RNA sequence: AGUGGACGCAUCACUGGUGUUCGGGUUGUCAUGCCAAUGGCACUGCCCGGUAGCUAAAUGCGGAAGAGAUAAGUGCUGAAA
RNA sequence: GGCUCAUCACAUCCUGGGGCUGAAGUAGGUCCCAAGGGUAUGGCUGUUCGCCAUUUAAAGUGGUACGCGAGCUGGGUUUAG
RNA sequence: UCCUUGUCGGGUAAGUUCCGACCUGCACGAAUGGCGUAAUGAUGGCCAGGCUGUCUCCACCCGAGACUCAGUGAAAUUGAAC
RNA sequence: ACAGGUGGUCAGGUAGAGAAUACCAAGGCGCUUGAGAGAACUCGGGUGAAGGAACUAGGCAAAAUGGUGCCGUAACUUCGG
């Protein structure tokens, strides 16, 4: 009960709310010397674990020929921008099978409303 | 090591527990009363006090998912029927444990576990 | 070496001694190698001999490590002389000398 | 500090015999390099030389450099600033890589 | 100095303007009233009796209730007591707060840590396990031999063998401070602390540099 | 998350392709390599007219890790392929001239951040 | 493992002393009825707390 | 002063594993009269995930500093002489 | 002989304290005290040992009936072919 | 028969096993059969590709024992034992 | 009243190449001790992050492919493979 009001004091309000399987913008904040930026991340979100203060969801996209995933915190003050380009329709909550095959030839529909 | 773990192993598979509470759930709310042993009756709990309060609202959804449980077309006709109107003005408590002493073939504690109401 | 820039502990000491190779033990156990001394000289030292003896290599730059005594090379057990018609080898090869 | 440390440096540098300098700008290019700022000397022990004055100043200057990368070799040295990165470099080695791309 | 009990409640983290993510460990330590405090003259060291929590006085022992009685203090959950530091004083019925531990920045937590049962040899000491093949027959995470052929004629004492895990204290030192709430009553520390929740924990000053 | 006789991927145009690392570094019973790390390799696969050759042992540094590596702040950055980049065995300059493939900024601490300076991609 | 001695009935007694039967000494009256019971069982007229119980 | 390997302790908040007690996809077959919908069996029938608990690969802490008497050694003063 | 498990003595491999030095500093060499802790991963062969490849502080020496099959292994030795 | 496992090459970063060869080798040995031999072999030895808890390093879970209760109820061994 | 051995005949449906296989028709049984929490450990298994034979004498055990149609299929050869 007392550990349950602590988050709502730390949590932030403005995180929007998307489907597991949508292409998802987000710009990290970094840290270097005294100077603090923006790096931006273009992926499609593969898995969602939306648990209190310490939800979570992880981002994989391809460069270069290969594959990369990210993992994130949706109430962490690392991420400051997050936003939705392609809003994908997947039936499946989990989105663990894009490694096995190519990106190429695994593109995800649009939701189409 | 069973740290803040539920449902307990009573010496048979996953599927032999599912039938055996399929079985015994189906028998208690046939006959308004069965005595069994005392791990058992507090097991069945779990399952039998739970297909009244899905028998609580009648529905052909509900209906269905209650078809599912228990396996018998008399079990559920007799839910949605009669114990719905009966155990409507009741939030949980269907049962009660009425242990009876021991077994003489084996020393097993019994338990006559029977619905509350017991028809008044 | 760098650091050393004299012969003062050759003065010092004139007998160099490397470690003598390990004999044969039982369980057919072969002994170890003997270390190889490495001895630290001053760079641009010249090396003479006797018996006609010439010069071995000069030294120019630091870091070049030179052969100069080939120690002996390990005799053979009476295992290595196993066969048929003899079937109990009491011969053994000495070890040849340093 | 993005045009004062660039200014600060190209200059300095040149005083110590700072040859063939080339200012990038390589913004929305890189995430973590800024400025990407080229010198050449001329071997090992000119090259060592500056890489040495450039540290040396900027524990004076306040801001403390984050690493260094030439060890017992001077075939590749770069030393950092923060946000401005400075490469001292030699003239055959150079061609080996690539220019003014990266 | 003298140390406060607390409840453990749970793991959380705290999240830094910088972007750096600390572990916390949430501890409700409540209000500690002190019940008798000893002195050099009575039996030879300085201790401070101190109790926390409520109980109902139904189960409320007589003995228990007029010892509480005694320095006009209520019931508490349990009964512990702390070291003095040779040079501080305190009088009974004071209740003892949370704020001396705005300026520790380290605190010592010990406790009793979760009960394991019977725990195997190859988990209470990490022992090697046996290849699992090969021939290996009937053994495949025993211990294995015990002593020597003959010449002991026995097992030595403190041996490491298979025995029971937990329902002991244990202790962990030097645990770093994050935040001390004052008007809620939680003490927040940086790491994990011995024991589950709802597990007594008794919480001091770290001894340590 | 890289042990000894591990196969991993080559990430510069140094010759390597396929590359098997042989000897973590760290200290004694070093268990397992990291992200930022010195390991030792044996190449098991390149091109002929390259600058090395197959069968030769010396250093390299990973730069992607299958398990990730742990950002600071409850991250992870995953990879899809093993790699490394070719060093010498005297000295810790890297061979190759170019880098493929991203290279996490944690690489910075490590004290190598010449290969952060190449491989524009992250 | 085998024994090499014989044990003795002051071996075999020790080690039975563990052994001895625990009398229950927790008999209750029901207050309708009055029949010996454990706590919280039926008595063997089936009866319990002094409601009616099925009794059969 | 900082950062590393092994070792030990503690917790599951993070990252994962298990999670045959949760949900879903699917093949053959039987049954609920039948369409639909379900349940049984086929290693949990085969897989996709996945609650708590447990756990490490995951994250925090520790090897002290200091006090007394000391070994080798270094000493102060000082006779036998 | 290998795996699990270790223990003890110091004729000490490293760490620790020193003496001498033909010890400018780093780096060294010999000797003394000190057993608190640590003291490797793979190919070859059944291997003990050893060679080689590569790390670190080293990859210590011996007792334990050259420890440990009422713990495992049957690779060598191994009756019968 | 020996010395520097014989030493060069493949196989490996590292190969007392394997593969055609250098020689200082000739005993066997030609129906107590010699050489080569496609196919065949639960045949001896070595290597490679996919694959995995064989392993670093084990962890969790499903079942039967192991544990307690109720009933029946052995064993090898034992000069006596505080 | 033993998880062993024992010759002949009858040979249903579903998918299948079938007397293999999974369910199932008629038919026969739940295997003459059971109830409890699921400790170490033992046995039969399921799953697993990173690596993939680095353990071991030895890929032992495990793990993996596994069917049909089509294309293509080396050295060698007794021309069959």
Redesign the pocket.
Same mark, same amino acid.
């Given at each position: 009960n007392i550990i349950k009001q602590l988050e709502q004091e730390q949590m932030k309000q403005d995180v929007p709310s998307f489907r597991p399987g949508d292409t998802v913008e987000v710009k990290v904040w970094v840290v270097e010397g005294s100077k603090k930026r923006l790096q931006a991340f273009e992926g499609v979100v593969i898995?969602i674990?939306n648990?209190?203060?310490?939800?979570?969801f *992880?981002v994989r996209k391809i460069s270069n020929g290969e594959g990369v995933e990210r993992?994130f @915190?949706t109430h962490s003050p690392v991420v400051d921008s997050i936003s939705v380009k392609r809003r994908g329709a997947v039936?499946?909550?989990?989105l663990? +099978?894009l490694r096995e095959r190519t990106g190429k030839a695994a593109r995800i529909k649009e939701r189409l409303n | =090591?069973?740290?803040?773990? !539920?449902?307990?192993?009573?010496?048979?598979?996953?599927?032999?527990? @599912?039938?055996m509470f399929?079985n015994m759930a189906g028998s208690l709310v046939r006959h308004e009363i069965i005595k069994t042993?005392?791990?058992?009756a507090?097991?069945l709990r779990r399952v039998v006090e739970p297909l009244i309060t899905l028998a609580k609202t009648d529905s052909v959804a509900n209906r269905?998912?209650a078809?599912?449980?228990t396996?018998?077309?008399e079990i559920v006709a007799k839910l949605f029927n009669e114990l719905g109107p009966r155990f409507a003005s009741r939030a949980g408590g269907y049962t009660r444990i009425l242990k009876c002493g &021991?077994?003489?073939?084996?020393?097993?504690?019994m338990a006559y576990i029977e619905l509350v109401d017991r028809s008044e | 070496?760098?650091?050393?820039?004299?012969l003062?502990?050759?003065?010092?000491?004139k007998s160099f001694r490397a470690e003598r190779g390990?004999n044969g033990? /039982?369980?057919?156990?072969?002994?170890?190698?003997g270390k190889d001394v490495t001895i630290?000289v001053p760079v641009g030292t010249r090396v003479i001999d006797q018996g006609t003896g010439e010069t071995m290599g000069d030294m120019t730059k630091h870091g070049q490590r030179l052969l100069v005594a080939k120690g002996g090379?390990?005799?053979?057990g009476n295992?290595? &002389?196993?066969?048929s018609?003899?079937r109990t080898?009491r @011969?053994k090869?000495n070890?040849?000398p340093g | 500090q993005g045009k004062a440390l660039q200014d600060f440096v190209i200059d300095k540098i040149d005083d110590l015999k700072g040859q063939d300098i080339i200012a990038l700008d390589v913004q929305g290019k890189s995430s973590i390099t800024d400025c990407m700022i080229i010198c050449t000397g001329t071997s090992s022990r000119h090259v060592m030389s500056i890489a040495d004055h450039v540290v040396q100043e900027s524990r004076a200057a306040g801001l403390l450099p984050l690493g260094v990368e030439g060890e017992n070799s001077a075939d590749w040295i770069v030393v950092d600033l923060g946000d401005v990165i400075v490469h001292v470099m030699q003239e055959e080695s150079r061609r080996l890589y690539e220019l003014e791309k990266l | 100095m003298i140390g406060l009990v607390g409840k453990?409640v749970? =793991?959380?983290?705290i999240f830094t303007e910088d972007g750096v993510?600390?572990?916390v460990?949430v501890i409700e330590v409540e209000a500690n009233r002190v019940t008798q405090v000893k002195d050099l003259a009575n039996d030879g060291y300085r201790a401070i009796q101190v109790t926390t929590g409520a109980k109902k006085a139904n189960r409320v022992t007589k003995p228990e209730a007029g010892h509480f009685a005694k320095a006009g203090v209520e019931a508490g959950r349990g009964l512990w007591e702390f070291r003095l530091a040779e040079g501080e004083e305190f009088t009974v019925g004071q209740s003892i707060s949370v704020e001396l531990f705005a300026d520790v920045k380290?605190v010592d937590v010990t406790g009793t840590?979760?009960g394991?049962?019977?725990?195997?040899?190859?988990?209470?000491?990490? &022992?090697?396990?046996?290849?699992? *093949?090969?021939?290996? /027959?009937?053994?495949?995470?025993?211990?294995? !031999?015990?002593?020597?052929?003959? *010449?002991?004629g026995k097992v &030595?004492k403190g041996?490491? =063998?298979?025995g029971?895990?937990?329902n002991?204290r244990?202790?962990?030192?030097?645990?770093?401070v994050v935040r001390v709430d004052a008007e809620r009553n939680l003490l927040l520390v940086?790491?994990?602390?011995?024991?589950?929740?709802g597990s007594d924990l008794i919480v001091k000053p770290?001894?340590?540099? | 998350?890289?042990?000894?006789?591990?196969? $991993?991927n080559v990430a510069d145009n140094s010759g390597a392709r396929r590359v098997?690392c042989?000897?973590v570094?760290?200290? /004694?019973?070093?268990? +397992?390599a990291?992200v930022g790390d010195i390991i030792?390799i044996?190449?098991?696969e390149a091109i002929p007219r390259g600058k090395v050759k197959?069968?030769?042992?010396l250093?390299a540094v990973v730069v992607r890790?299958?398990?990730?590596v742990?950002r600071?702040?409850? /991250?992870?950055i995953?990879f899809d392929?093993?790699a490394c980049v070719l060093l010498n065995?005297n000295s810790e300059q890297p061979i190759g001239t170019r880098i493929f493939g991203p290279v996490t900024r944690e690489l910075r601490?490590e004290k190598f951040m010449k290969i952060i300076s190449l491989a524009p991609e992250v | 493992?085998?024994?090499?001695?014989?044990? *003795?009935? !002051?071996?075999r007694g020790m080690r039975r002393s563990h052994?001895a $039967?625990t009398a229950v000494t927790s008999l209750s009256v029901d207050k309708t009825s009055g029949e010996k019971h454990l706590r919280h069982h039926i008595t063997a007229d089936g009866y319990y707390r002094g409601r009616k119980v099925i009794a059969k």
């Open positions: 898995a674990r648990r209190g203060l310490h939800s979570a *992880t993992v @915190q039936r499946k909550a989990k663990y +099978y | =090591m069973r740290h803040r773990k !539920s449902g307990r192993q009573l010496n048979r598979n996953s599927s032999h527990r @599912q039938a399929r042993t005392l791990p058992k507090k097991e269905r998912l078809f599912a449980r396996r018998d077309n &021991f077994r003489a073939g084996d020393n097993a504690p | 070496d760098e650091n050393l820039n004299t003062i502990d050759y003065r010092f000491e390990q033990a /039982s369980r057919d156990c072969t002994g170890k190698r630290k090379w390990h005799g053979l295992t290595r &002389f196993k066969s018609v003899n080898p @011969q090869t070890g040849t | - | 453990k749970g =793991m959380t983290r993510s600390i572990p460990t380290k840590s979760k394991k049962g019977f725990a195997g040899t190859v988990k209470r000491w990490n &022992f090697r396990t046996q290849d699992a *093949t090969h021939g290996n /027959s009937l053994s495949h995470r025993v211990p294995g !031999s015990i002593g020597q052929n003959q *010449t002991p &030595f041996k490491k =063998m298979a029971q895990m937990g002991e244990v202790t962990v030192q030097s645990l770093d940086k790491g994990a602390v011995p024991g589950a929740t770290a001894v340590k540099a | 998350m890289i042990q000894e006789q591990t196969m $991993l098997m042989i000897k570094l760290g200290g /004694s019973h070093r268990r +397992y990291g030792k044996t190449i098991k197959k069968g030769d042992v250093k890790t299958k398990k990730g742990r600071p702040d409850g /991250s992870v995953r392929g093993n065995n601490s | 493992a085998v024994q090499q001695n014989k044990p *003795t009935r !002051s071996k052994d $039967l």
